[PDB]
Amino acid sequence: KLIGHEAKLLFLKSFQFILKRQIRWLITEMRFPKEFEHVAKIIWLKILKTINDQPQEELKLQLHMTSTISILYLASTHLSLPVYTCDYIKWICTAKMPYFQASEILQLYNKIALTCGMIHFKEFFNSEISCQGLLLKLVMQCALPPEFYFYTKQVIEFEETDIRNLTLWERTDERHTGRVSNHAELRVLSYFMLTINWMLSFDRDRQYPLKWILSLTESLTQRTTTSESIGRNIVKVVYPDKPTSSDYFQWSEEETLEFLKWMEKQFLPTQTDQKIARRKLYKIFPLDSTHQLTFIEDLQERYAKQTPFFPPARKEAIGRLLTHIASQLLVDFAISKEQLKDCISRIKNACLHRMN
């Protein structure tokens, strides 16, 4: 029945097909540019041509879903679109961008560096990351006041001097203390954390008192339904490590409610004699002035909830703010606790050393 030994072709044809399917959904539903496509045909063209310039029945192929996302990101980043990995994670974990099947029923940083050596970033594309929108994304993601965008943008310039890249790739696998935390975004997040920590816990002109660290913390902590927070809950549900699942334990009836809403909407994007017996069996018990508020609405009101702006246990407030931020980042950027702190650790010693 099924092909043998050179279904390499059908493999690459369901793969290619599934990719173009995803692009259809990101220009259409995510209002990308038509140019993305040609950028993608070029990159997947490059690596298709490289596996077909190492093609052999002695076959060594590893086209994963991760490869699909990797060339979307790769291509986006040449195009300097302000999209970041966390966009992609949210997208795929939400069953919105098709993924999590072979043809539905009818490691990202590491595979982007991997592809990023597979065909070379340097003399074919421009692999500067869209840094400044990552900053904006980040300050808005906290409720940090717009000064911190320049705060961090400065520390960024201080260590890197504005330059950011996509290969820490030589084919090698045995990596230890050499060339890792060389994927840029992670360093940006690290800088971001550091900034908040130094910046706050060391402005002796403390313009920022003993307490607005607290009010900041609480306006950060208040579980309140918008699209975004609801999303981050939806991500939290598929994030590998506790605690971020104790989190669904602590949801509010409103959070749970918008949850079941999203449930019955995007699990009509569900997957999969007795078959019709369960088509009926399930169709026995029933499948089935605007309220909750927008992003900048919520954002406004926490900015106001702190608008009363105008003592080493504030170090505490610093720490719990940092660790909350951290958590949001871990789920949002699909990495590990221990990964993050490896990076911020390394790069903080990397800042002390290039100032000391």
Partner 1 sequence: VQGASLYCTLAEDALDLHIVVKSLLCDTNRLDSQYIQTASDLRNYRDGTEIIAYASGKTGSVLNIAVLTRQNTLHLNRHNNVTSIELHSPIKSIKIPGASESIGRRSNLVGIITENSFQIFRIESVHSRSCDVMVSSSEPLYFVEIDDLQVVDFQFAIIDIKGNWSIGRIPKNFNNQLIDNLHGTIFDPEELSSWKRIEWFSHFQKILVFDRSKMIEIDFMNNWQTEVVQAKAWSNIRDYKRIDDKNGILLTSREIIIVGASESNDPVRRISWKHDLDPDDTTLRITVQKVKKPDHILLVAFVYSMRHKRIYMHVFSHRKANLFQSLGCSTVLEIPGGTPTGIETIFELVVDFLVKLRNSSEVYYYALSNTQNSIIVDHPEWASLFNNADEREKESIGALVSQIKLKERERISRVQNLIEHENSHDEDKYLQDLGYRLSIATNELLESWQKTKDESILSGSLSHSKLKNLLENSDSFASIPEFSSLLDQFFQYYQDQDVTFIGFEKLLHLFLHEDVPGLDIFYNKLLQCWVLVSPQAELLTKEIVKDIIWSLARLEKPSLFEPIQNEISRSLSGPYQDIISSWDMDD
Partner 2 sequence: MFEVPITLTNRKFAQRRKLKYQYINYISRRFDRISKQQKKRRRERHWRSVSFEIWRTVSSQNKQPINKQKMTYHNFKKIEKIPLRKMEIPLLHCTKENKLYFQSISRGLEPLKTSTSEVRNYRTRHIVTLTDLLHLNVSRHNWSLAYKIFATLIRIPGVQIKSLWGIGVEILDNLSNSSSGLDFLQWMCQIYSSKSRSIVPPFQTGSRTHTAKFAITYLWSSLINCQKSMLIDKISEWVLTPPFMEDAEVWFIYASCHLLKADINQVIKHIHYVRTFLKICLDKGGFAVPSRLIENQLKSFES
Partner 3 sequence: LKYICAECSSKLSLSRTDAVRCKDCGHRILLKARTKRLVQFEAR
Summarize as ranges the residues that interact with partner 2 (CB under 8 A): 93, 100, 237-240, 245, 248-249, 251, 253, 256-257, 259-260, 263-264, 267, 270-272, 277, 281-282, 284-288
Which of 56, 274 has the CB closer to partner 3?
A: 274
CB-CB neighbours of 262 under 10 Å: 17
Q: Which of 73, 99, 109, 149 binds partner 1 (CB under 8 A)?
A: 149
Which of 172, 177 has the CB closer to partner 1?
A: 177
Any contact of residue 257 with partner 1 (CB under 8 A)? no
Which of 24, 283 has the CB closer to partner 3?
A: 283
Any contact of residue 209 with partner 1 (CB under 8 A)? no
CB-CB neighbours of 149 under 10 Å: 18
Where do the H-state alpha helices sit in the chain?
A: 8-30, 35-51, 65-78, 85-93, 108-118, 131-141, 147-159, 184-202, 212-221, 227-236, 246-249, 253-266, 274-282, 295-305, 314-332, 337-353
In the block, residue with structure tokens 């790069």 = 347
Binding track over 284-303 against partner 1, x by CB under 8 A: ----------xxx--xx--x
Window 189-218: residues binding partner 3 (CB under 8 A): none
CA distance 313 to 210: 9
Q: Which of 273, 287, 353, 355 binds partner 3 (CB under 8 A)?
A: 273
Any contact of residue 276 with partner 3 (CB under 8 A)? yes
On the 0-12 / 13-18 / 19+ scale of CB atoms within 10 A, 123 is exposed
Window 35-54: residues binding partner 1 (CB under 8 A): 35, 38-39, 41-42, 45-46, 48-49, 52-53
Closest CB 92 distance from partner 2, rounded Å? 9
Binding track over 277-306 against partner 3, x by CB under 8 A: ---x--------------------------
Q: HSE of 76 in the Cβ direction (CA atoms, 13 Å)?
A: 22
Closest CB 287 distance from partner 3, rounded Å? 18
Closest CB 266 distance from partner 2, rounded Å? 11
Q: Which does 276 bind (CB under 5 to 8 A by kind): partner 1, partner 3, partner 2, none?
A: partner 3
CA distance 51 to 119: 11
Closest CB 237 distance from partner 2, rounded Å? 4
Question: For the packed helices 85-93 and 314-332, what is the interaxial angle rounded to 10 degrees?
Answer: 60
Largest CA distance in the chain: 76
